[PDB]
């Protein structure tokens, strides 16, 4: 019965094409669906579309780039600003675009904390060469990291016209 009452009120909602969620009669229930306009289905764990620790380690392993300079802390924050305002990342609303930036500086400080212990990056040459593979973040990866975190964020939006309340009635009822 509680499945029946729920879906007999919530069935005629769909996220319209200007991201608003309206009733059948045109009246607005939500201005964006759920604040960010994001699918709960495509949503990653913790109610966040990315879980950035997993994507960055995925990018480092799918694209390890040997013979690359991998310099950091002085270039990483500089490459992540040159890429992020580059003809793109306008449709990313700047609540997500802050969240990349606070994660990138969060992994920018992790680099300098290791290079604090040893291994100066004077030009990227110390005598034990292995030390530059401690936290390798080389700028072929960090630009592929952004082009993935953009497109994973853009894909996991609420597709317009998606019977939004009819998803809600199942997900409360089941």
């Amino acid at each position: 019965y509680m499945q029946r009452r729920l879906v007999k009120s919530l069935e005629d909602l769909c996220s319209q094409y200007d991201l608003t969620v309206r009733s059948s009669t045109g009246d607005i229930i939500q201005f964006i669906y759920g604040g960010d306009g994001l699918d709960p289905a495509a949503m990653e764990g913790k109610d966040e579309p990315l879980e950035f620790k997993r994507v960055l380690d995925n990018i480092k392993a799918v694209f390890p780039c040997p013979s690359e300079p991998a310099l950091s802390k002085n270039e990483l924050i500089l490459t992540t600003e040159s890429i992020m305002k580059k003809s793109e990342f306008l449709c990313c609303q700047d609540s997500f675009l802050q969240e990349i930036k606070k994660f990138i500086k969060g992994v920018s400080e992790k680099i300098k904390k290791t290079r604090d212990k040893y291994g100066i990056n004077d030009n990227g040459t110390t005598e034990p060469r292995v030390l530059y593979q401690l936290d390798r973040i080389t700028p072929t990866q960090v630009e592929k990291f952004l082009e993935t975190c953009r497109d994973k964020y853009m894909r996991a939006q609420m597709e317009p016209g998606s019977a939004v309340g009819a998803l809600c009635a199942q997900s409360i009822g089941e």
């Binding site: 729920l6 005629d12 969620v21 009669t25 229930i29 317009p160 016209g161």
Partner: protein
């Protein structure tokens, strides 16, 4: 640290007493937050007290579903609970109400008023056999064949 939970209902008489910081006190009765603390706090309890009772039973759920159910339930002025009665105050069309409970009274009363309903939603487009506009019937499709608004002939 100390707090105290009551089994009562008189909220603002509890919120106003000496010693209780009334800025931080909640209920679990979403009507007594609506009467006392506005509608917007009554939205946040319907978010909370569902998401409190859903994580209590295991049963993880996205908040974006509860952020929709609460925001439907309180968007017409007051908290409209999803019963037979709350549907009358939410929907205008008759057959969507008439396909729900009280099919006798809802059809006669909308004949007493001269109720012109348009056929929208899904509980009427399914009854009438129209392709519903929710989902795949939202947009419509054109064809891309060779055409132009052409010049006429001289008359």
């Amino acid at each position: 640290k100390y707090k105290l939970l009551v089994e009562g209902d008189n909220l603002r008489a509890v919120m106003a007493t000496h010693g209780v910081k009334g800025t931080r006190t909640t209920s679990n009765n979403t009507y007594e937050v609506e009467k006392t603390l506005g509608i917007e706090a009554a939205r946040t309890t319907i978010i909370n007290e569902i998401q409190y009772t859903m994580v209590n039973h295991g049963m993880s759920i996205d908040r974006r579903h509860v952020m929709l159910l609460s925001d439907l339930m309180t968007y017409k002025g007051e908290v409209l609970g999803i019963t037979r009665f709350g549907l009358a105050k939410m929907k205008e069309s008759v057959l969507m109400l008439a396909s729900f409970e009280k099919t006798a009274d809802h059809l006669f009363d909308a004949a007493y008023f001269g109720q012109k309903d348009s056929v929208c939603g899904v509980s009427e487009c399914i009854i009438m056999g129209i392709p519903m506009n929710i989902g795949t019937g939202l947009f419509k499709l054109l064809h891309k064949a060779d055409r132009d608004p052409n010049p006429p002939k001289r008359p």
